[model samples]
Target: RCLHQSKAAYFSKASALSAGACGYGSLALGLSGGHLAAGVSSLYKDGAGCGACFQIRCKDSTLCSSEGTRITLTDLNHNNETDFVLSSRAFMAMANKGMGRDILKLGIVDVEYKRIPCEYKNQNLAVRVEESSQKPTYLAIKLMYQGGQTEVVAMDVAQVGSANWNFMSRNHGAVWDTSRVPNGALQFRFVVTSGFDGKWIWAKSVLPAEWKTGVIYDSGVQITDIAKE
Candidate 1:
C-alpha cells in the first residue's frame, strides 16, 4: 500500500456541513496499487462510476512523515476540540498479523459509560483481522440495533492455513440502522474463532445523525493476540 498525505482543510469544508456542531469528517485513507489484481484503481475504474482516483493531499508534504503517521481527525475549530486518531499502517497491520487468525474476542464500553445511541442509517461498521505471516482467513461481521439486538450480517471465510482478515461496511458485510437506536448507547463486539482458540475485539462511537452528511463521533480499539483452546 502507498502512503500519501494531504491537508485536512481540503476535506474540512465538505466535512463541516456533515460534521455539525461536533465537527466530524471522513476521508479515504489507503489506496492499493493498480498492479495488484482487483486493486484500488480497478475499484474506481470498473466498480464505482466515479472516474477520479482518490488521493490524499497534504498542505505541507514535508511535515507528512512516516514517523508517527497516525490519521487524526481533529476539531481545530472548537475550543473543546477533540481528535479521533487511527494508528499508522505498520503498527496496526503488524500487530493484527502477529496475533494470528485464531478465535479473537473484543469489546467496547463508553469512556464515561455515556449512553449515546449509534445511528447506522447511512453509516457502517467495519472489522478486519489476519494471520501474523499470511492473509486473512476468517471474518464475521454484523449490523447492530438498539435494545441490545444485532444481526449476523456477513461472514467471509477465504484462504487456508494462516489467514488475513479485513472487513469494511461499504463492502455490504453488516450494517446497523441508526433509526433503531433513537435514544440509548451503541456498542459492538467482534469475535474470531478457530479450531484451537478464539479472540475478541470491539469498538464504540457516538451515533451520527440519520441521513445526514459530514463527520460523526466514533472510537474503536485495535488488538492482536494468539488464542489457544
Candidate 2:
C-alpha cells in the first residue's frame, strides 16, 4: 500500500490523550504505552478507526528517523491542517535520538503514515460495560484492545446459546448500546470489515450472568485479520 502524507501536531500534556474521543478513557495508556494519537475524520472513520494502529514518520530527514514511531488511534482530531494530533511522547519518539526537543519545538511537522496491524501479546479482544449500563434493561459496552487492521462495522448481542440476537447500535466512538439487552450470560457476534469483505467474529460467551458495570470481560477471542488498504 502507499503511504498517506499529512501534517501532525502534539498534545502539550501527556494526560490530555487519556480521556480520548474513543472512550477508552485511562485504559488507553496500557493499550499503546503512551504512544496514542487522535486521527482526522477520514482516519477516525466515525469511531470504527479507534484502536487502529499507524506507523508515522516525519519528513525531515535531519530531525526524524525513517522508522518513525507506531501509535494507536484513541481520539479524533478536528484540525484541518493536520491529519493527526499525537501525544507529546509519541511526537518525540519520531525524532532522532537527542533531537526530540528540537522536533517538539517545531510544534507541527509534515508526516507520512500508513495503517498497520495492532498486536497485543497474549490478550483477547475485550468488552468493558460502560457505566451507563443498567441491569435487565439497557446495556452499553466499549470494545477494547481489538487486534489486527480491521474495523467492526456491526455488532449483535444475545444470551448464551440463544439464536435470539439483539442488534446493538454504535453509540459514538467505540461504544455500542442497545435497550433490548439480552438477559443472563451474554455472547457477541461482530461483523468486522475484513479483506475485501466482512465476516462474523463470534465470542461464544463473554459477559457473565451478572456482568457488572464498569468491568471488562474477555471476549475469549482475538482478531488477526489484516485488511490491506
Candidate 3:
C-alpha cells in the first residue's frame, strides 16, 4: 500500500487553501498568531474530511497542538441521545455495513472525548452569565466532511442559574450547505436574536484531515499542521 503525505502551512491571522489528494476535494486551514496572557486557546475543524487535520496555537510563547479526525458509525434514532461514537478505525471497518455519516454537533453542556470547547452567545436571547465574571464561559464543536455536506437538523439548549432560574431554548440546526461555502471551511456563528447579536465564544478542535489519527496531542502545531503553517 502507498501512503500519500502532503504538507501545507499557514501563519498568524492567515489562511491556507489546497486541493485534497483526491483532487475532487478542497480544504482550507486557518491560523491566528500574536501575544497571549494567562488564558486557554482553542481550535476547531469545520469540514468533513476522510483523514485528519492539525491545529497549533501559541500563547505567551507556549505552543499547543492537536489532531482533529473523523469517525463514522450508524446513527441511532434515540431521543435520549444525539449521536453515536465511532473511531476512525471502527468507521473504516464498518464502512460496508452502511454506517451513515456522522454529523459533529456539540454544545458546552455536552462535553465528550471528541468534543472541544467552542463558545457563543447573543444579547437577543438572555444573559444568564457574563463572560467577564465566568471562568472560560463558552462551548462549541468542530465539524468534518468527507463527501456530502452535513446539515444541522435540530438543536436544544438548557440554561441553569438557580432552582428558581430556569431557561430553555431550542431551534432547528442551522443550514450548512456545501454549495454555499466558498472554500471547504465554514464557521457557524450562533445567535441569540434575529440579527445574531449574542456574545459567543469557542475553543475548536483542529481539522482531522492533517493528522495521523483523530486525536489532539499538541496545541501550537495543531492548527499550523492543518493550515500548513
Give the Cα lDDT of each candidate.
0.24, 0.90, 0.20
Candidate with top TM-score is: 2
TM of each candidate vs. truth: 0.24, 0.96, 0.17
Can you tell me which runs of candidate 2 are displaced by over 4 Å?
A: none
lDDT of 2 by residue, 1-229 (tens): 4589999998865555459889888888777788889999988999999999999999988899989999999999988789999999899999999999999999999999999889988899999999998878899999988999899999999999999987899999999999998779999999987787989999999999999998989999999887757
Judging by lDDT against the true structure, name the best candidate.
2
For residues 1-229, write the lDDT of model 3, one tens digit per residue: 1122221111121211222221111121211011100111121112122122222111111111122222221111122222222222322222223321221111101112232211111111111111111122322222222111121222222221112221122210111212121121112222211122332221121222222222212211111111111
Q: Per-residue error at 109 for model 1, in Å?
A: 47
Span of 10 residues, lowest total lDDT, candidate 2 = 12-21
Q: What is the C-alpha RMSD of each candidate to the true structure, in Å?
A: 19.8, 1.2, 21.1
Candidate 1 accuracy as TM-score? 0.24
The local lDDT score (0 to 100) that residue 22 gets in candidate 2 is 90
